Amino acid sequence: KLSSRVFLDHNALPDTLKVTYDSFCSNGVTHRNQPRGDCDGVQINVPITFQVKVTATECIQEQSFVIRALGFTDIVTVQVLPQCECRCRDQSRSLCHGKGFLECGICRCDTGYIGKNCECQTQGRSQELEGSCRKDNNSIICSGLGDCVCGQCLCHTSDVPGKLIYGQYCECDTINCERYNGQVCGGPGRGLCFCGKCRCHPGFEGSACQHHHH
Amino acid sequence: QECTKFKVSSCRECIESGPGCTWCQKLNFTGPGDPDSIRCDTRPQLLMRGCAADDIMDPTSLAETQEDQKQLSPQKVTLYLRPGQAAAFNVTFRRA
Numbered sequence: 001k002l003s004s005r006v007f008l009d010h011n012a013l014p015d016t017l018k019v020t021y022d023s024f025c026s027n028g029v030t031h032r033n034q035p036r037g038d039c040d041g042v043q044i045n046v047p048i049t050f051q052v053k054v055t056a057t058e059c060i061q062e063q064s065f066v067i068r069a070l071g072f073t074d075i076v077t078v079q080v081l082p083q084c085e086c087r088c089r090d091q092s093r094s095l096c097h098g099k100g101f102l103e104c105g106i107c108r109c110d111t112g113y114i115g116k117n118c119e120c121q122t123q124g125r126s127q128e129l130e131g132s133c134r135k136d137n138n139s140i141i142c143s144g145l146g147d148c149v150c151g152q153c154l155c156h157t158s159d160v161p162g163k164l165i166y167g168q169y170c171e172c173d174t175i176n177c178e179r180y181n182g183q184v185c186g187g188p189g190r191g192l193c194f195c196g197k198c199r200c201h202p203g204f205e206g207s208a209c210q211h212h213h214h
Numbered sequence: 215q216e217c218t219k220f221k222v223s224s225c226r227e228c229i230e231s232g233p234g235c236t237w238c239q240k241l242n243f244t245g246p247g248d249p250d251s252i253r254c255d256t257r258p259q260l261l262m263r264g265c266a267a268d269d270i271m272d273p274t275s276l277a278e279t280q281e282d283q284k285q286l287s288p289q290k291v292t293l294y295l296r297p298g299q300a301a302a303f304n305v306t307f308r309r310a
């Protein structure tokens with residue numbers, strides 16, 4: 001029979017899915033972006049076209065909805081699937097330190113591990129302390145003598161005998177104190193060098209342990 | 215086009231942010247100091263930043279006609295929906 005009303009509707013959809021319709025009807029009549037399809041007066045074997053646009057506002061899971069014309073038994077079953085996952089060539093087996101796998105050119109870390117190469121483990125808060133790799137807001141990293149590893153300074157090694165770079169900001173060492181008689185702090189028989197201050201053994205005094213108690 | 219990346223740490227999180235986002239999968243692309251989110255940008259940004267075309271991940275929504283009786287055609291459709299990107303397909307009505 002001549003079909004004087006073709007309403008295209010869908011059944012109930014989640015919040016996450018929206019559908020609109022353009023109706024290209026046989027009357028020289030077109031409607032755009034409406035919540036249902038609507039054409040008045042379809043002739044015998046004269047086809048009309050609805051364009052259905054479906055948008056998700058997030059990644060949904062496999063599910064289906066149906067579109068039907070009211071009063072007719074035929075049905076369009078619309079299977080919906082997410083298009084959120086990437087399709088990347090990755091390698092199974094460094095350089096996430098065993099605490100992760102690569103995926104699309106970056107490491108994906110296991111539970112209780114962070115950092116680009118999964119080199120750090122999680123604390124209570126870890127990377128927030130990276131301001132605690134700078135002695136103050138406007139200072140360089142670890143006094144230029146260390147690297148920030150997991151929001152904490154790891155000081156550079158030294159080859160110089162008796163020298164160690166230490167401190168929260170690698171700001172200290174065990175050789176830059178005042179000298180006396182050739183050796184730092186008067187040599188090990190008189191005192192010890194710590195962060196520029198000589199710590200004199202019982203018996204000796206002065207900035208470089210040059211004197212005896214008087 | 216348009217891409218905002220707050221807390222983007224993976225390719226998937228990037229694609230989820232919005233339809234104008236794409237992801238550079240080339241290891242070469244990043245240096246020690248850069249955050250992972252620099253891989254997530256519009257196509258033109260990544261391209262003139264040195265990402266090759268064949269390493270830019272950018273999955274798109276599409277309609278797939280699966281099975282195609284009388285008045286409503288097709289009977290079955292499959293849609294892959296990237297968030298914020300419409301998939302479109304046509305339904306033909308017919309009668310006698």
Ligand SMILES: CC(=O)N[C@@H]1[C@@H](O)[C@H](O)[C@@H](CO)O[C@@H]1O
Nearest residue numbers: 022024049050051052302303304
């Ligand atoms: C991509 C697609 O299927 N869209 C079509 C459009 O190309 C065509 O203009 C119309 C037929 O008039 O039906 C839909 O709107």
